Design an enzyme around this catalytic site. Structure first.
Site, PDB file in Angstrom:
ATOM      1  N   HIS A  46      27.362   6.336  28.304  1.00 41.71           N
ATOM      2  CA  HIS A  46      26.753   6.617  27.348  1.00 41.71           C
ATOM      3  C   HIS A  46      25.437   6.194  27.181  1.00 41.71           C
ATOM      4  CE1 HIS A  46      30.992   5.788  25.555  1.00 41.71           C
ATOM      5  NE2 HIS A  46      30.889   7.155  25.801  1.00 41.71           N
ATOM      6  N   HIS A  48      23.097   4.576  24.570  1.00 38.27           N
ATOM      7  CA  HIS A  48      22.889   3.665  23.565  1.00 38.27           C
ATOM      8  C   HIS A  48      21.374   3.682  22.781  1.00 38.27           C
ATOM      9  CE1 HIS A  48      27.005   1.851  23.194  1.00 38.27           C
ATOM     10  NE2 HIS A  48      26.936   2.855  24.362  1.00 38.27           N
ATOM     11  N   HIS A  63      25.883   4.259  20.005  1.00 39.52           N
ATOM     12  CA  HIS A  63      25.488   5.668  20.711  1.00 39.52           C
ATOM     13  C   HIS A  63      24.144   6.054  20.048  1.00 39.52           C
ATOM     14  CE1 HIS A  63      30.017   5.990  22.142  1.00 39.52           C
ATOM     15  NE2 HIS A  63      29.228   4.994  22.308  1.00 39.52           N
ATOM     16  N   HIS A  71      31.091  11.420  17.338  1.00 35.11           N
ATOM     17  CA  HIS A  71      31.203  11.140  18.727  1.00 35.11           C
ATOM     18  C   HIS A  71      32.080  12.509  19.613  1.00 35.11           C
ATOM     19  CE1 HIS A  71      31.671   9.029  22.458  1.00 35.11           C
ATOM     20  NE2 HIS A  71      32.851   9.517  22.742  1.00 35.11           N
ATOM     21  N   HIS A  80      27.474  12.863  19.808  1.00 34.53           N
ATOM     22  CA  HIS A  80      26.166  12.171  19.989  1.00 34.53           C
ATOM     23  C   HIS A  80      25.033  12.620  20.960  1.00 34.53           C
ATOM     24  CE1 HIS A  80      28.933   8.806  18.094  1.00 34.53           C
ATOM     25  NE2 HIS A  80      28.411   9.707  17.264  1.00 34.53           N
ATOM     26  N   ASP A  83      26.263  11.203  24.254  1.00 31.84           N
ATOM     27  CA  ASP A  83      27.345  11.243  24.784  1.00 31.84           C
ATOM     28  C   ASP A  83      27.685  11.930  26.053  1.00 31.84           C
ATOM     29  OD1 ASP A  83      28.479   9.931  22.532  1.00 31.84           O
ATOM     30  OD2 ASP A  83      29.158  11.825  21.612  1.00 31.84           O
ATOM     31  N   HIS A 120      31.337   1.408  30.023  1.00 29.17           N
ATOM     32  CA  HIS A 120      32.499   0.914  29.555  1.00 29.17           C
ATOM     33  C   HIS A 120      33.752   0.498  30.280  1.00 29.17           C
ATOM     34  CE1 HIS A 120      30.789   1.217  25.369  1.00 29.17           C
ATOM     35  NE2 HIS A 120      30.210   2.228  25.831  1.00 29.17           N
ATOM     36  N   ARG A 143      31.622  -3.368  26.948  1.00 27.72           N
ATOM     37  CA  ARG A 143      30.334  -3.044  27.846  1.00 27.72           C
ATOM     38  C   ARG A 143      30.413  -3.898  29.028  1.00 27.72           C
ATOM     39  NH1 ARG A 143      26.204  -1.878  22.868  1.00 27.72           N
ATOM     40  NH2 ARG A 143      27.708  -0.744  21.547  1.00 27.72           N
TER      41      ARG A 143
END
Ligand code: MET
Ligand code: MET
Ligand SMILES: [Cu+2]
Ligand SMILES: [Zn+2]
Ligand SMILES: [Zn+2]
Ligand SMILES: [Zn+2]
Lengths: 153, 153
Positions: A46, A48, A63, A71, A80, A83, A120, A143
């Site tokens: 993603h 951020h 996000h 999401h 988002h 995403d 992630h 993360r």
């Protein structure tokens, strides 16, 4: 044509290089590159909100969500802007990334330049996980690696 | 009230954190923070064109120069937009940065978000060095540390 790049770094080493290209400002963004040093399987991927890595990837915040939506996955209307789904790693721990996205942009209000790209620990459930966290983070966990998205030549 | 941040790192011991703040569209940007692990004395300090760290600081390219000017000091009319002068380190090898600049911006065509901040080996001669490279790089030498400038909270 507008171009951007991100170097992902994290403990492992997790190392990645991701390129962005947008031929036209009202057009899609192609995202491509490679990530090594992660476990086989799905890893959430993603944009951020903040390009702040002062204290690591945590500093990047949530996000990127300029339109205040829930999401989802990249093919969902309800998502988002940041995403981008999952990348999938092989047994060698290499994820080859080939995406085209129509919601991120490299200019304007959905611009991702100066924000953080994060890979992630776990899979992103694409908002289909049936808890409250699914609709915020996709249950993708910690993360593993991140970097700030910059303008490229 | 626009904010940005940059984490500086290199191949060696040089590390830094630099904060930007701009209260007003087209108002001055305040730049503050700290850099450690450098030698005592002056180190050139500039925004370079690209937020590209693919192969380290070299990938950032030349000074950010959207108006096609010669290299100078921050108090010169003839300067690159990215020309922020020098930071000065003490015998501790610590440089405390406190700069205000009216030429860089955090929005618009002088925007530095998504570009690279670089701290150099040597002093920047602010284009008063009287050789050709002085009017290009300020003779500041190699790139000790750098980072992409990100949007902050
Ligand atoms: C049509 S080329 C393949 C595009 C792919 N989505 C990419 O990341 O560029
Ligand atoms: C009036 S505060 C001192 C200004 C300084 N240039 C800064 O970076 O904040
Ligand atoms: Cu994420
Ligand atoms: Zn999301
Ligand atoms: Zn330089
Ligand atoms: Zn310059």
């Amino acid at each position: 044509a507008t171009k951007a790049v991100c170097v992902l770094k994290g403990d492992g080493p997790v190392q990645g290089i991701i390129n962005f290209e947008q031929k036209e400002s009202n057009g899609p963004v192609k995202v491509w590159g490679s990530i090594k040093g992660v476990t086989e399987g799905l890893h959430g991927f993603h944009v951020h909100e903040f390009g702040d890595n002062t204290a690591g990837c945590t500093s990047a915040g949530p996000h990127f969500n300029p339109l205040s939506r829930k999401h989802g996955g990249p093919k969902d209307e309800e998502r988002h802007v940041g995403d981008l789904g999952n990348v999938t790693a092989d047994k060698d721990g290499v994820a080859d990334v080939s995406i085209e996205d129509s919601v991120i942009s490299l200019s304007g209000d959905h611009c991702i330049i100066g924000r953080t790209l994060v890979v992630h620990e776990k899979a992103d459930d694409l908002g289909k996980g049936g808890n409250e966290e699914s609709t915020k983070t996709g249950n993708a966990g910690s993360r593993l690696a991140c970097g700030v998205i910059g303008i490229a030549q």
